[PDB]
Amino acid sequence: KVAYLTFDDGPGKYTAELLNTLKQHDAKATFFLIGANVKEFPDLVKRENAEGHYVGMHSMTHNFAKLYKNGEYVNEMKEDQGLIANIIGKSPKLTRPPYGSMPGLNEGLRNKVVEGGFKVWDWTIDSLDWRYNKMPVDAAAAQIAQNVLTNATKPQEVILMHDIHPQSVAAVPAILKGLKEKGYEFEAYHEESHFPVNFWHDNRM
Amino acid sequence: RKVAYLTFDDGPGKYTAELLNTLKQHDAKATFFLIGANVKEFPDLVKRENAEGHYVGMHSMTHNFAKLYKNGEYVNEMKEDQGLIANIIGKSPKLTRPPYGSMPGLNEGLRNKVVEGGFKVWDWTIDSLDWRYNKMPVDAAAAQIAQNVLTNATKPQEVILMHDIHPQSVAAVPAILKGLKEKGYEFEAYHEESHFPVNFWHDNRM
Amino acid sequence: RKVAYLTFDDGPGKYTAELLNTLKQHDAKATFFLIGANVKEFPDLVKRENAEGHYVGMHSMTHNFAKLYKNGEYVNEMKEDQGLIANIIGKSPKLTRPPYGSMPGLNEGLRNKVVEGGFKVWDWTIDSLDWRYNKMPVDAAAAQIAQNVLTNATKPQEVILMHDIHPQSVAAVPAILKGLKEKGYEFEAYHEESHFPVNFWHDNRM
Amino acid sequence: RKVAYLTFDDGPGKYTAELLNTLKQHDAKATFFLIGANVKEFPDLVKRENAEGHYVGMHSMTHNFAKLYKNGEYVNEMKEDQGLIANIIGKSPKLTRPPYGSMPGLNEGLRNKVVEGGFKVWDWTIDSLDWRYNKMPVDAAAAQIAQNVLTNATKPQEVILMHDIHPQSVAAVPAILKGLKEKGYEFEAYHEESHFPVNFWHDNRM
Numbered sequence: 081k082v083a084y085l086t087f088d089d090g091p092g093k094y095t096a097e098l099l100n101t102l103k104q105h106d107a108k109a110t111f112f113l114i115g116a117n118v119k120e121f122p123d124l125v126k127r128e129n130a131e132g133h134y135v136g137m138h139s140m141t142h143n144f145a146k147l148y149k150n151g152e153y154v155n156e157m158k159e160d161q162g163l164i165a166n167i168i169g170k171s172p173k174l175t176r177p178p179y180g181s182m183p184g185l186n187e188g189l190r191n192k193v194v195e196g197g198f199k200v201w202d203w204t205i206d207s208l209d210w211r212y213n214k215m216p217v218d219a220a221a222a223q224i225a226q227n228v229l230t231n232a233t234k235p236q237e238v239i240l241m242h243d244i245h246p247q248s249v250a251a252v253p254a255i256l257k258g259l260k261e262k263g264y265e266f267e268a269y270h271e272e273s274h275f276p277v278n279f280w281h282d283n284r285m
Numbered sequence: 286r287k288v289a290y291l292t293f294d295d296g297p298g299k300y301t302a303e304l305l306n307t308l309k310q311h312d313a314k315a316t317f318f319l320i321g322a323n324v325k326e327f328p329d330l331v332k333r334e335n336a337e338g339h340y341v342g343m344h345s346m347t348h349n350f351a352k353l354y355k356n357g358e359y360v361n362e363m364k365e366d367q368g369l370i371a372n373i374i375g376k377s378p379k380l381t382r383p384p385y386g387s388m389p390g391l392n393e394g395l396r397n398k399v400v401e402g403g404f405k406v407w408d409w410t411i412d413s414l415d416w417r418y419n420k421m422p423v424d425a426a427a428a429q430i431a432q433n434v435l436t437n438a439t440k441p442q443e444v445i446l447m448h449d450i451h452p453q454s455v456a457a458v459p460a461i462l463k464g465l466k467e468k469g470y471e472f473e474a475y476h477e478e479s480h481f482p483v484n485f486w487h488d489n490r491m
Numbered sequence: 492r493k494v495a496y497l498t499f500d501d502g503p504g505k506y507t508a509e510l511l512n513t514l515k516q517h518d519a520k521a522t523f524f525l526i527g528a529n530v531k532e533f534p535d536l537v538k539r540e541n542a543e544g545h546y547v548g549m550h551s552m553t554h555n556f557a558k559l560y561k562n563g564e565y566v567n568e569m570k571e572d573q574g575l576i577a578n579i580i581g582k583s584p585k586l587t588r589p590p591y592g593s594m595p596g597l598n599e600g601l602r603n604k605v606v607e608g609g610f611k612v613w614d615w616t617i618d619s620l621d622w623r624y625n626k627m628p629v630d631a632a633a634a635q636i637a638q639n640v641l642t643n644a645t646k647p648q649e650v651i652l653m654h655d656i657h658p659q660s661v662a663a664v665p666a667i668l669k670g671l672k673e674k675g676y677e678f679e680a681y682h683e684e685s686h687f688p689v690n691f692w693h694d695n696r697m
Numbered sequence: 698r699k700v701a702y703l704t705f706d707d708g709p710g711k712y713t714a715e716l717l718n719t720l721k722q723h724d725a726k727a728t729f730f731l732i733g734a735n736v737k738e739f740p741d742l743v744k745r746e747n748a749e750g751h752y753v754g755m756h757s758m759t760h761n762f763a764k765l766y767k768n769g770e771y772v773n774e775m776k777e778d779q780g781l782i783a784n785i786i787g788k789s790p791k792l793t794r795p796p797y798g799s800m801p802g803l804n805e806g807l808r809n810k811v812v813e814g815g816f817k818v819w820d821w822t823i824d825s826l827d828w829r830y831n832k833m834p835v836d837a838a839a840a841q842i843a844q845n846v847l848t849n850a851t852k853p854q855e856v857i858l859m860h861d862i863h864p865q866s867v868a869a870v871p872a873i874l875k876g877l878k879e880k881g882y883e884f885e886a887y888h889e890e891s892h893f894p895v896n897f898w899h900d901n902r903m
C-alpha cells in the first residue's frame with residue numbers, strides 16, 4: 081500500500097515547517113505549486129525537489145473562468161512548468177487542476193493536455209482542511225487527521241492537502257502515524273510510475 | 286455515521302407533491318431551494334415541504350446569471366425570496382443555493398455581501414445531472430440518474446444536486462433512497478443550527 | 492387472451508371504405524386516428540367507422556412537425572380535431588396518436604398539457620413499414636407488409652401502425668387478420684375504460 | 698436476418714482511428730458521415746475508413762441548419778462534400794445524413810432536389826444520444842450509451858446514431874458490439890446496391 085500526499089496552492093509560510101516534518105518521518109510527497117508562489121519562494125521550490133519530493137504545477141492564476149471557460153489551462157501550466165524548470169532544471173509534466181478536472185476540463189482541453197505532454201491528477205481523499213481555516217490550530221488539525229484516516233481504505237491513495245494552512249500542516253504528523261500504522265508507504269509521484277487518477281477516468285492523463 | 290442531503294432545485298413545480306409523497310413514504314427528509322416565481326405559483330407546496338420536515342431555502346428570483354452575478358443582484362434576490370418564503374412558513378431561512386452554482390459567479394465581493402447579510406451558501410458534492418435526461422423513456426432516465434448518484438456516494442456527507450421540476454428526476458428518488466441507505470446513508474434535511482460549509486470557493490464563512 | 496389492436500393513421504381516405512368492409516367480414520375491430528381535413532372531407536366514413544365498432548381518435552390538424560412540437564400546438568390541434576369528431580359521433584374522444592410518434596417531440600411540457608387537457612397518447616409496438624412499399628405493385632407490397640407485421644407479433648398485447656390512405660397497407664389487412672388470429676390474437680378497438688399506457692416515453696400518466 | 702448499421706457522424710475526428718481499430722478487432726463494418734472541414738483536416742482517415750470496408754457518406758460542409766434548410770443549401774453542400782470525399786477514395790458516394798435529422802429541415806422542396814440530384818438520405822432508428830454524455834466520467838458515459846443502444850435494438854434492421862468525435866462514444870462501441878452480437882446482429886456497412894429508405898418523412902424516393 082502506498083500513500084501519496086499532495087499539497088496545493090504553495091509554497092507558503094508553513095511549507096518550510098512541513099518539509100521538516102516530512103524529513104523527520106522519512107516521508108516523500110507531491111507539491112502542485114502556483115506560479116506566483118514559485119516566483120516568491122524559489123528556495124522552497126528548490127528545497128522541495130532537493131529533498132526527494134515531486135514538484136508539479138497548479139497553474140498561474142488559479143482562476144476558474146480563465147483556465148476552463150476561456151481555455152487557458154494548458155497555457156498557464158506550460159508557463160508554470162517553465163518557471164519551475166528555471167529552478168530544478170527539469171520540466172515536470174504532472175498537473176493538478178485548480179478545483180479539480182471535473183467538469184472544467186472539457187474534452188477539447190483534455191486533448192490539449194495529452195497533446196502538450198502533460199498529465200493531470202486529481203485526488204482520492206479531500207482532507208477538507210479548508211473547513212477549519214482560522215480556528216484553534218491544534219484541534220483544527222486533529223480533525224483533518226480524522227477525516228483522511230477515516231477514508232484510508234484503498235491500496236493506492238492520493239490526498240488533497242494545502243501547505244498554505246497552519247491547520248493542515250499541523251496534522252501531517254498524525255496522518256503519517258495513522259497511515260503507516262495501516263500499512264501505508266509515503267511516496268512522491270514519479271513520471272514513469274504514472275497511472276491515471278482523474279475524475280473523468282480519462283486514462284490518457 | 287453517514288448522512289445524505291437530497292437537495293431539489295428550481296421548485297416548487299408540478300411533480301413536487303409526488304416527490305413530497307415518496308419522501309414521506311421512506312421517512313426521508315430533504316432540502317428545497319426555490320425560485321420566487323414558483324414560491325408564488327405553488328404556495329401550498331412550500332407550506333407543505335416545510336410542514337413535513339424539509340428545509341426550504343432560496344435559489345433566487347430570476348435565476349438569471351447576468352442579473353445575479355454580473356450585476357450583483359444575488360443578495361438582493363435571495364433576500365426577496367427569503368421574504369416570500371417566510372410569509373408562508375413563518376420563518377426566514379438563511380441558506381441559499383446559487384443558480385449555476387457559486388463558481389465562478391459569486392465573486393469575492395458578492396461573497397462578502399452574502400456573509401454581511403447573514404446568508405449561508407450551498408453548492409453540492411454530487412451532481413445527479415438529472416435535468417440532462419430529457420430525451421429518453423423516463424423509466425430509463427431515472428435509472429441512469431440513480432446510477433449516477435449511487436456510484437458517487439462515497440464520503441460521510443454527500444450533498445446531491447437534483448431538480449423537482451423534471452419527471453425523470455422525481456422518478457429516480459425511489460431507487461436513490463433504496464440504494465443510499467443500503468450503503469448506510471440517512472436522509473436528513475439541512476439543519477440551520479448545524480451548518481457546515483459546502484461551496485466551490487472553499488470559503489468557510491458561508 | 493392475446494389482444495391485437497389494429498391502428499390506422501392519417502385517414503379517412505379513398506381506400507378506407509374498402510378496409511371497413513374487410514374488417515366487418517372478419518368481425519374485426521380496429522382504431523382510426525384521423526386528420527382534421529380528412530374529417531372535414533369524409534364525414535360519412537368517420538360516422539361509419541364509429542358505427543361499425545371502431546374507436547375513432549385523433550391524429551391532429553396539420554400533421555406538421557414544427558407546429559405541433561416545436562411551436563407547441565399539439566394539444567391545441569388535438570382539441571380542434573376532437574371537436575370536429577365530436578360533431579359527427581357525439582362523443583369527445585380522448586386517445587391521441589402523435590404524428591411521427593411521441594419521441595422525441597412530445598417533451599415534458601407538452602405531456603403536462605396532454606395530461607391536463609384530458610388526453611391520452613398512444614404510439615405502437617409494430618411498424619407495418621407500409622410506407623416503404625408506396626407506388627409499387629399492391630399485392631407484392633401487401634404480402635410484404637404482412638410479413639413485417641406477422642413476424643414481429645410476439646407479446647400478449649400489440650399495437651400495429653398502419654395507414655388506410657395507402658393501398659398496399661389495406662390490401663394486406665386480410666393477410667394480417669389471417670396469421671395474427673392463427674397465432675391466437677383477437678382484434679379489438681381501443682376501449683377508453685380499458686386504458687393502459689403504450690408510449691415511447693413510458694409516461695404512464697398518458 | 699438481423700443487421701445493425703452503425704453510423705458515426707461529424708467525423709473524421711481525433712478518436713476515429715482508435716474506433717477504426719476496435720471495428721477491425723471484431724471484423725465489424727460501419728458507416729461514416731463526414732463534415733467536409735474534417736475531410737480536409739483528416740484525409741488519411743477518410744481513405745482509411747473506406748480502405749477498411751466502411752461506407753463513407755456525406756454529412757454536410759457547414760452543419761448549419763439555417764444555411765442547409767432555411768436557405769436550402771443542403772444538396773449544394775452534399776455535392777461539394779461529395780467531391781472532397783471522391784478526390785480521396787475515388788468513389789462518389791450517394792448517401793447523405795442530414796445534420797439534426799431530415800425532420801423538419803428537409804422539406805418537400807429540398808427532398809425533390811435530393812431525389813433529382815441522384816442522392817439518398819438516411820436518418821436513423823436508434824439515437825444513442827452519445828454526444829450528451831459530455832459531463833461525466835468517460836467510462837460511465839460509455840456504459841449508459843451502451844445501455845441505450847443495447848436496449849432499443851429490436852427490429853430486424855437498426856440504424857444506430859453515434860458520433861466518432863467524442864471519447865465517450867468510441868469508448869462505448871466495445872460493449873455495443875458485444876451486446877448486439879449476443880442479441881444476434883451482424884455489423885454491416887451501408888451498401889448502395891442494397892438501398893432501402895430510412896427517413897423521418899417516410900419518403901421512399903430517397
Ligand SMILES: O=C(CCc1cccc2ccccc12)NO
Pocket residue numbers: 294295344383384385386412414416
Ligand atoms: O441552478 C441550478 C444549477 C443547475 C445545474 C444543474 C446541473 C449542472 C449544472 C452545472 C453548472 C451549473 C449549474 C448546474 N440548480 O437549480
Ligand SMILES: O=C(CCc1cccc2ccccc12)NO
Pocket residue numbers: 706707795796797798860
Ligand atoms: O447531426 C447530428 C445531430 C443529432 C441531433 C439530433 C437532434 C438534436 C440535436 C441537437 C444538437 C446536436 C445534434 C442533434 N448528428 O451528427
Ligand SMILES: [Zn+2]
Pocket residue numbers: 088089138142177178179
Ligand atoms: Zn488549489
Ligand SMILES: [Zn+2]
Pocket residue numbers: 500501550554590591
Ligand atoms: Zn401520420
Ligand SMILES: [Zn+2]
Pocket residue numbers: 706707756760795796797
Ligand atoms: Zn451532425
